[PDB]
Design a protein around this ligand. Sequence first.
Ligand SMILES: [N]S(=O)(=O)[N][C]C1234B567B89%10B%11%12%13B85%14B%1158B%12%11%15B%139%12B%1061B%12%112C5%153B%14874
Ligand SMILES: [Zn+2]
Length: 258
Amino acid sequence: HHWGYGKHNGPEHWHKDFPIAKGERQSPVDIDTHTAKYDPSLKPLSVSYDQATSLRILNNGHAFNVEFDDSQDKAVLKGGPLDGTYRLIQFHFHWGSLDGQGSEHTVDKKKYAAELHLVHWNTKYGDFGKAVQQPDGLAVLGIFLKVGSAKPGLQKVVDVLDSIKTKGKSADFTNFDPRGLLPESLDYWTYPGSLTTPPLLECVTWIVLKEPISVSSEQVLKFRKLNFNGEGEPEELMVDNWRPAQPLKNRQIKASFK
Ligand SMILES: [N]S(=O)(=O)[N][C]C1234B567B89%10B%11%12%13B85%14B%1158B%12%11%15B%139%12B%1061B%12%112C5%153B%14874
Ligand SMILES: [Zn+2]
């Protein structure tokens, strides 16, 4: 009986194995745009993905992960609220069964069709496993997806999903450029939070871009053809793999923009 997104193992059950689910800095959250305050102390955000080296794409039974070589500083996030250098390790998405749901963060209670998480770790801690044990160990760049025009830089991902339909399947995925998944604007909201999946560790500086990217109906439909189950098991479509908004508690969301 492991964790997932169903009635019997979903978000409302996670706290039994992972008591930090009811912690003081859980993610995601609703971003109330009128309560978020512009912060002049924020430095410019630097997304440096030119040298990124993708390796593989994996269906882990919860989402698909595009993994990167993070054995040197090649694709890095710095600036904004961050002190130091954070290395890109992987990205993945959360999405819905319908276009009106799928994001984890919400904006004035609005749910987007999906949300992209680019996961980075603070190089001062030497490895990802050490980083997740620290309050400032990770920086996750969150980008909302809405349905409209196709995102050309997403299509290479979309076209490999056939090869990784079921839990445990992986495919080589070299030379993928994550720059093609970014919107024009780097305007963002930031707050201290957590991983939104077990182990729900309170180790993340969240940076959520205000500008969504647009993807086509056909693109998101292909996400929805993935499977939570393993090969030769009854088919359970990989949809609605999002955690809902959690209590903000003693936190302020800061805006990079006026
Ligand atoms: N939505 S999230 O990025 O907070 N958490 C997803 C994951 B998957 B697995 B590792 B990988 B890295 B860590 B565990 B799980 B946690 C981050 B990725
Ligand atoms: Zn995520």
